[PDB]
Amino acid sequence: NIVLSYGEWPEYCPKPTRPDVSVNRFYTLSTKSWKTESTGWYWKFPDVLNDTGVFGQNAQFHYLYRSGFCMHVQCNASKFHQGALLVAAIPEFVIAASSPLYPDFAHTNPGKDGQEFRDPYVLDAGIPLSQALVFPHQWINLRTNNCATIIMPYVNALPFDSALNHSNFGLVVIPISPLKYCNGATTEVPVTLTIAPLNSEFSGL
Amino acid sequence: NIVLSYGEWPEYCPKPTRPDVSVNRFYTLSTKSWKTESTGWYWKFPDVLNDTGVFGQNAQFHYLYRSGFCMHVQCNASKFHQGALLVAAIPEFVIAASSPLYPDFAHTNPGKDGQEFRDPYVLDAGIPLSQALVFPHQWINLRTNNCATIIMPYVNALPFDSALNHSNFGLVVIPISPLKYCNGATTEVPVTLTIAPLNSEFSGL
Amino acid sequence: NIVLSYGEWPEYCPKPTRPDVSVNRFYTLSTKSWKTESTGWYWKFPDVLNDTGVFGQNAQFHYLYRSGFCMHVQCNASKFHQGALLVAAIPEFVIAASSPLYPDFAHTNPGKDGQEFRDPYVLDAGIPLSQALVFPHQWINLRTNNCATIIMPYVNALPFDSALNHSNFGLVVIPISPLKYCNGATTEVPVTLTIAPLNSEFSGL
Amino acid sequence: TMVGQICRYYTQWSGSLKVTFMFTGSFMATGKMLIAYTPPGSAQPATR
Amino acid sequence: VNEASVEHFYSRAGLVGVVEVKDSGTSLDGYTVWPIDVMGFVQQRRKLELSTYMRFDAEFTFVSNLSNSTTPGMLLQYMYVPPGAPKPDGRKSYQWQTATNPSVFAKLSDPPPQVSVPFMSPATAYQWFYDGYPTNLQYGQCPNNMMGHFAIRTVSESTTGKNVHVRVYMRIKHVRAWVPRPLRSQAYMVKNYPTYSQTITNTATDRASITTTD
Amino acid sequence: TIWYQTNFVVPPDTPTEANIIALGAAQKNFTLKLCKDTDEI
């Protein structure tokens, strides 16, 4: 039902301020449309929240922070659609470039609107997809469950690090088995995402 | 040493948010220079804090608030200067126009830089100055004490009211006995002010 | 108020004679005049007492001695003068020569009248002045305190040593912030010194 | 300083520092200085 | 020591305003509307501005008669339009009846009507000084002090030939005052604003020298 | 940074400019690591 990443609950690290209050509310990112031809998406937060809400007001004006995330992905489709998604949160996600030389900055930090994979088979990190299940993952299978939920604690070497440089991890949604629907059905099945940062901290205003 | 206005301490009124934290810090307004010719100043806050600091970030984005103020005025002058000031906090301070027709908006809400009186004798409200001691006041007398301190609670009919309209009260500094100094002494005696809002509240983001 | 050098009180070292009596009295050296242009002074005792008093009668006719000193420097100036002095007692103080070759003997043992620095910035020992606070020191600041007092025990490798050769340490007075005074005030601010040897001993008549 | 010199002998350091001011002016003088510190990730302030 | 109390100091009843119907001569209208203004007379105004916030119930009386000081029986309708309800257009307008407008039917022959108004304001007290704008004509105007208009008319059916004067008295009960204010030295210019004349008047009457007395 | 809050005020017959000196030091928790010889010389 819920996958705790690596079997732990995020927690404080015993003067850093604890905002609590209004940075604990859910944020609803724009809804991506999963077509029959579409392939993949990824986000790589702390990025996605840098502009939005009061959170971005904390992360831009503080020199250090600690945080943890609870992310919830759900997909609304009627029962006449098939297809399945893989949802995984892959820490320290470093992408690469194809050659016939470095990835453009739009590919490194997409922002709240995510990005499309160029080569989903290799994740565009070079590693195969067949093995990507080694990271915390959940199956969204359109004949069974429409929702996938993950709690990812704060994983990094240093206790604190800045939000504008090191992006703690990333998130992928890959339609492993493509979508097919009989004629007349709605053409696009929407995918939405929700993130609610847990136990955040900030320091160094 | 300290004058509690009307013999009370400001207090909360038993969901409005209590910011506490960083709106309890002192704010140091720009230093007015009191010359031999100069006459009067006034401020009329909640105004003065609308732009400054995190406070103005609360007061502009909230539809209602409650607050109370602790204000501290001190004047640095050597012992070869004479002259005296009157410092009073006059609630519900409504000014007027001279005739040979309403006061310009620059005179109603001066901002952080205060304003000069046109007619200090009548306060430019029409009431005489001789009686203005009926309000909470303190004497700054340059041969005795250089500091004057006041705590003014929240006085208004309604429990809450907005910061951009009703200015709860005002503050005056009038050099009743003019300044004289022998030749060679520093020409201007600076006046500074410090305000530290107490027990503030806000609601209706 | 008082700086014990290195956190100790001078003491005897358990047949050496203990004079006590009249070598425990204060000695008042001649009063140096600190001008606006003047820079620095130094003494380097046991030297200063070799001629004066009954002490010099002991130190010249004895082949070995042990001693400790209590030195007191005070500066009389009215309240219309500014400027500050640094007073430090620097053990094993060895001076140097400038080059375009050794320091003349008048610079090594000045006598009761002290000496002027050639280069106060480097102490004329080669070490910077900014760090000279590492030695026991006291600030004479003409708007606050007019007196500085030091107790320096007997610091040297051997238990005893002769007064005519090894000069146990030295003392500096450097006007770090120069003196300024408005026209008409007294032109020179006098500096005086007082030393009262403690727990002295002598041997080998 | 001192700490300035013997921190040239070590690759890494850490910890809080202390900075003290004195005023040499004459006993009569009077004024106000505003001493402001900026965290390391920002440019120095524009005006007070 | 009991005549210095704020309750006794505002006590006595006084003349708040004089209104006239005048339906006889060149003006045939036949009614009038009199918005309640406690400030009406500069004497009653200067005693109120002594205190900034005050909370009081009022009690009214209407002493009426013709232009002869002669009082024949003829009927009058005193209506009280509460704050926030529409005013009568003309002597026959349907507002003169409704329900919610409390009215007093009194002949002239009878001794004067009398009535007691409660405390009408939304805020816990009146404000005689309100800084700041209600939302430059606007500066310093209390929207919440309106007490109602006391519209009057003579029931007798059409065009009597009699102009009817009427006087209106007020007295303040149960008064409670808050933060005090110094009295006004300068003369008044207009009704709703403090604005004072350019030329200043001294508070004390001058004498010959700093020395001589009488 | 060091800002002037107010003008510098003095009675007559007084020097008009002062001088401020600063003193640096480290607190208790200051620590060092990994000895290395220096370039000062």
UniProtKB/TrEMBL annotation, chain D:
Protein name: Genome polyprotein
Subunit organization: Interacts with capsid protein VP0 and capsid protein VP1 to form heterotrimeric protomers. Five protomers subsequently associate to form pentamers which serve as building blocks for the capsid. Interacts with capsid protein VP4 in the mature capsid. Interacts with protein 2C; this interaction may be important for virion morphogenesis.
Subcellular location: Host cytoplasmic vesicle membrane; Host nucleus; Virion
Role: Protein 3AB: Localizes the viral replication complex to the surface of membranous vesicles. Together with protein 3CD binds the Cis-Active RNA Element (CRE) which is involved in RNA synthesis initiation. Acts as a cofactor to stimulate the activity of 3D polymerase, maybe through a nucleid acid chaperone activity.
Native organism: Coxsackievirus A6
Protein family: Belongs to the picornaviruses polyprotein family.
Signal peptide residue numbers: none
From TrEMBL, chain F:
Top-level taxonomic group: Viruses
Location in or out of the cell: Host cytoplasmic vesicle membrane; Host nucleus; Virion
Subunit structure, interactors included: Interacts with capsid protein VP0 and capsid protein VP1 to form heterotrimeric protomers. Five protomers subsequently associate to form pentamers which serve as building blocks for the capsid. Interacts with capsid protein VP4 in the mature capsid. Interacts with protein 2C; this interaction may be important for virion morphogenesis. Homohexamer; forms a hexameric ring structure with 6-fold symmetry characteristic of AAA+ ATPases. Interacts (via N-terminus) with host RTN3 (via reticulon domain); this interaction is important for viral replication. Interacts with capsid protein VP3; this interaction may be important for virion morphogenesis.
Family indicated by similarity: Belongs to the picornaviruses polyprotein family.
Known function: Protein 3AB: Localizes the viral replication complex to the surface of membranous vesicles. Together with protein 3CD binds the Cis-Active RNA Element (CRE) which is involved in RNA synthesis initiation. Acts as a cofactor to stimulate the activity of 3D polymerase, maybe through a nucleid acid chaperone activity.
Official protein name in the record: Genome polyprotein
Part of the whole protein covered: 518 to 558 of 2201
